[PDB]
Design a protein around this nucleic acid. Structure first.
Lengths: 218, 333, 335
DNA sequence: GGTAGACGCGGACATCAAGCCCGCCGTGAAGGTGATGACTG
DNA sequence: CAGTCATCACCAA
């Protein structure tokens, strides 16, 4: 619910009707769930049913702004469309609640203690390394839409980095083992490949419709 | 009228880090090619020699830990057995412009502060501050534990304009003391150079070389590295000594501490030696703070009375306030 | 009121250097400025299994084969040469003074009460009782640890250096001076008052202690051995590694300092057995026994806080022990 | 400025005990929105 | 008497 930052407190009183009962859709339409426990007259019931429709309906005119993006896109044999992208608040809320039960939570941490007790049976936990955090607003994020219930201006960004941007230094000098003993290529990123070629060599061909297509690229 | 919510003063009297080398006397004027005192890691069999807790004092473990040894790994630097002399060399820039902040929020407060500092300067210079810094350069205060019981200490100071040198001083650092500020005519020629640096009249770059006759193979004391936020096992290192590339060293902030031990103006025990120039006058290694906030002699009372409300303190506290502004810091509200 | 400081620190007094070994002929003692050093040598050895046997792998063919097969090890060794017979051991010693003044503290009133206690000690009894026992351990050659066991003649030459050159020279004969009794004479007490002037700040003391131990031709000398610890190596490649400096076998300075402070003949078991090194909860570790337990209330942490905080002065014998621990140093604090 | 044609086997690699205490971890600035309130030309 | 400019409380895990 984006709107006036110093007016988003009556929204809690308007949206508490989806807590407890099933009468969140009783305030605007179906005011039989707003006549018996509302205790207001016809003017008050009509004014509430009129004012509560201005949330889900339009608030203002459809427009844009100079600080918006509005990219160009080339058409197949024509000019251009301006594409003004928007921030998916619903999608970022869904993926944010999805990842807060996958990085921490009950099962995703009790499986980590089960690893810490070295006795675990197979149960799936999740680990998201090297993310980044971004803040919206600043010291006060309530001027932005809600961003407060369990967001707090912290959309969690998944990594999408290239592979080869954290390298080491090349030292193949005139050494007594840095010349002749360096005929193997002792790097730090081949341990995973050596461990995979080791630990993928014990399984038989009783489930051999997938494992016979990995050593062709290795 | 209020003080600004952001104030930033750059440091003046900016020294480098000092590097250690070793040799013998009568070669100390051919001492440009002395080899560096090196950092050596050693391992120590010792003894359990701490206090013992009585909160889980099981005598099966606690009365038996005393009899068994204690194994520690430390670091140590020594002089060579051929040599008997420590050499310490560092540089020092004296900047000037020591009342103008580098970051502010007000402009009226900035003009009030600059005219307050100009009121300080155009009736007395930096000379009382400059000769106290020249005292702490002339004796070898910056050799902290190294001069303690040293037989003879010599301090050489060079004034440098280009590749060639412009002016040279030599001293006997043990004749000059640590509690007095009695001087001669030779130290006043250094004080006028430092006071021409602090007032922006000239460019000042100094090379400070200190020799200490200690002994053959005796232990010197470089600065110890603060190793913070470890979370390790049973003390793989418990003393790491600071070095630069193959040379033991002293941090620049410890030499900077030793140069600004100027304050003999603090209330309780001003006859009991100079301490460093802090806002709250605190000597942390002795666990107390001269110039408390309750006795109105700290920097955040005298500064606000003298700049804002036109309540000039005594001159001996004006030297303390101007020394705190040569120091630097974040003096905002 | 008046609890102990949570941070205490005392810098050491009597700081020695590393003792470098060298070798030559006896009666060339006064020309011994250019004697070549004793060098550490690597050697490989073929022993037997002379060790105890575990039995968690017990079988009649395992242990018999392990005994009857040889043992192959690789050690270090230091020897006198095939023409020299005397071990020259040389180090320097600084005496600082300012004993009871700590280098770091928290409580100011505890610091002043500690300096009042130490200053009350220093004037009615000087440092002379500690200084003559220190001068005894400089007089005999206690710092030669194994290198005087069975030696024929031992010869100590202590010089006092107040300039470039010596101003004062001694010459003892370290076997006539024992290791069990503190008896003095008219040449040892001059060294004792030199050390006592150094411990009370009344002058500059720097010494150059040179010892000469006639051992024999080609015999093995015993430089200090060090820990190569906290690695978890493979194969155990070196069971013994000898400490050296640039191409010269040597003794660690802390082992020399250990020998210089074997002063304590006041520990409550006996004094006729001999002195032990002054350290709190006074414990020889090579014997596995800690004399002066905290149970019988005689250790440094009980004597010091009963003497400083509660004015309960200990016996006059134990005040030498408390001041000797202050000359030692250490980290004292919250219990 | 001469090819010539070869480099050994066996066997073995140490055990013991121990790994410190104390105090502390900086401050300033990083909010949009209507809604009168004061100004108002 | 009507636009407009600086300030003002309104919220907020």
């Amino acid at each position: 619910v984006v709107g006036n930052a110093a007016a988003l407190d009556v929204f809690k009183f308007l949206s508490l009707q989806y807590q407890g009962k099933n009468l969140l859709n009783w305030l605007t339409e179906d005011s039989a769930e707003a006549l018996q426990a509302l205790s207001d007259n016809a003017e008050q019931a009509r004014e509430w049913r009129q004012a509560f429709i201005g949330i889900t309906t339009v608030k203002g005119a459809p427009a844009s702004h100079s600080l918006a993006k509005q990219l160009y896109f080339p058409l197949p044999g024509s000019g251009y469309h301006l594409l003004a992208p928007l921030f998916p608040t619903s999608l970022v809320h869904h993926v944010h609640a999805l990842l807060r039960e996958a990085r921490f939570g009950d099962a995703a941490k009790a499986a980590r203690e089960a690893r810490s007790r070295q006795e675990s049976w197979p149960h799936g936990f999740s680990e998201y390394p090297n993310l980044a955090i971004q803040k919206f607003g600043g010291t006060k994020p309530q001027n932005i839409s809600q961003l407060n219930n369990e967001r707090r201006g912290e959309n969690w960004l998944l990594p999408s980095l290239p592979p080869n941007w954290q390298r080491q230094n090349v030292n193949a000098p005139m050494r007594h083992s840095s010349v002749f003993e360096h005929d193997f290529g002792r790097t730090p990123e081949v341990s995973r490949l050596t461990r995979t070629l080791q630990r993928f060599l014990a399984k038989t061909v009783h489930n051999n419709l997938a494992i016979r297509q990995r050593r062709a690229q290795l | 009228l209020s003080t600004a919510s952001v104030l930033a003063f750059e440091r003046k009297l900016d020294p480098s880090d000092a590097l250690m080398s070793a040799g013998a006397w009568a070669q100390r004027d051919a001492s440009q090619e002395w080899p560096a005192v090196t950092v050596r890691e050693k391992s120590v069999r010792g003894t359990i020699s701490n206090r013992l807790k009585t909160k889980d004092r099981d005598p099966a473990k606690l009365d038996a830990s005393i009899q068994s040894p204690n194994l520690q790994t430390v670091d140590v630097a020594n002089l060579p057995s051929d040599a008997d002399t420590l050499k310490v060399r560092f540089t020092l820039r004296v900047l000037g412009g020591a009342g103008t902040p580098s970051a502010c929020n007000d402009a009226a407060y900035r003009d009030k502060l600059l005219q307050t500092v100009a009121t300080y300067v155009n009736d007395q210079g930096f000379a009382e501050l400059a000769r106290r810094y020249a005292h702490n350069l002339a004796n070898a205060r910056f050799l902290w534990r190294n001069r303690v019981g040293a037989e003879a200490v010599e301090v050489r100071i060079n004034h440098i304009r280009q590749g060639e040198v412009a002016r040279a001083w030599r001293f006997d650092a043990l004749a000059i003391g640590l509690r007095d500020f009695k001087a001669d005519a030779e130290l006043d020629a250094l004080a006028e150079l430092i006071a021409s640096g602090l007032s922006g009249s000239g460019h000042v770059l100094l090379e400070v070389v200190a020799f200490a006759r200690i002994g053959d193979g005796q232990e010197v004391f470089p600065s110890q590295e603060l190793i913070l936020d470890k979370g390790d096992k049973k003390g793989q290192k418990s003393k790491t000594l600071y070095s630069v590339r193959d040379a033991a060293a002293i941090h620049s902030q410890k030499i900077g501490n030793a140069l600004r031990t100027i304050d003999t103006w603090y209330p309780d025990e001003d006859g009991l030696g100079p301490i460093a120039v802090e806002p709250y006058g605190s000597v942390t290694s002795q666990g107390k703070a001269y110039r408390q906030p309750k006795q109105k002699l700290d920097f955040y009372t005298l500064l606000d009375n003298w700049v804002l409300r036109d309540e000039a303190p005594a001159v001996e506290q004006q030297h303390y306030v101007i020394a705190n502004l040569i120091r630097g810091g974040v003096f905002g509200e």
